[PDB]
Design a protein around this ligand. Structure first.
Ligand code: CAZ
Length: 260
């Protein structure tokens, strides 16, 4: 299609490997570019972890208020919010917002621990019909995003369909899906990624990811005015282990998609 030609050109100009999946919920049409290839999720897997805890809260109705201790041994490579609460506690709601809106990795690790380990996140994905997602590791001081490594990967198509079910669909309970949407809309780390390529009349909720091999990711739910919402997943990774982030590529992907 015309969109796939422009995305292929973007990828060629970029020196890396781009994966895109768009779902237009008006008519369930999809646009895919490398949609069935695996990409390291990096921090975009935090949406699944937060959603899995939200799912637990449909039974444990006050779970989001539960305090969690933050100890020095909990700190990993990047924990901008949790570091402010060492030797105190944060609620699971506060940890979820920190994980989602400030990409706090200690907060993500507490969500994973609440689910019983990364296999609890993967299980939630399977329970909502995502067979592709796999989360294998907690965050540590040394995380990886290695080409060909199947750990902590998904495909663009699978992530877009899951994000759709979690936000626009009813894979979560009513207050839970609204809470997830609020958190995603409040993300503070995405200004240079998908949001930068979209018309400013569109409301966006997104989660970014970044990692080794210059891996640069963003997954978004998009609400244009007077038009059915869109789900857009943009994954990007590069051949050099120490490659720089390329959030501009994600912005350009989104701009190509929005034009179409
Ligand atoms: C999610 O993607 C997180 N990324 C990381 O923790 C990784 N690297 O973080 C930096 C700070 C660059 C580091 O080198 O320590 C990483 C490397 S391999 C892998 N799987 N993850 C957080 N999310 C973001 C984000 O884009 O939202 C960041 C800006 C980095 S921390």
């Amino acid at each position: 299609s015309a969109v796939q030609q422009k995305l292929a050109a973007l990828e060629k100009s970029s020196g890396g490997r781009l994966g895109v999946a768009l779902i237009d919920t008006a008519d369930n049409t999809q646009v895919l570019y490398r949609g069935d290839e695996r990409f390291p999720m990096c921090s975009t897997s935090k949406v699944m972890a937060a959603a899995a805890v939200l799912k637990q809260s449909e039974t444990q109705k006050q779970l989001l208020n539960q305090p969690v201790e933050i100890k020095p041994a909990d700190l990993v490579n990047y924990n901008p919010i949790a570091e402010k609460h060492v030797n105190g506690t944060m609620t699971l709601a506060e940890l979820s917002a920190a994980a989602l809106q400030y990409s706090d990795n200690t907060a993500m690790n507490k969500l994973i621990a609440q689910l019983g380990g990364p296999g609890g996140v993967t299980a939630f994905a399977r329970a909502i019909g995502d067979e592709t997602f796999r989360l294998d590791r907690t965050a540590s001081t040394l995380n990886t995003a290695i080409p060909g490594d199947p750990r902590d990967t998904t495909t663009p198509r699978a992530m877009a369909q899951t994000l759709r079910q979690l936000t626009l669909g009813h894979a979560l309970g009513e207050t839970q899906r609204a809470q997830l949407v609020t958190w995603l809309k409040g993300n503070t780390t995405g200004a240079a990624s998908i949001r930068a390529g979209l018309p400013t009349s569109w409301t966006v909720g997104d989660k970014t990811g970044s990692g080794g091999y210059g891996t640069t990711n963003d997954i978004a739910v998009i609400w244009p005015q007077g038009r059915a919402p869109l789900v857009l997943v943009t994954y990007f990774t590069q051949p050099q282990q120490n490659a720089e982030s390329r959030r501009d590529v994600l912005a350009s992907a989104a701009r190509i998609i929005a034009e179409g």
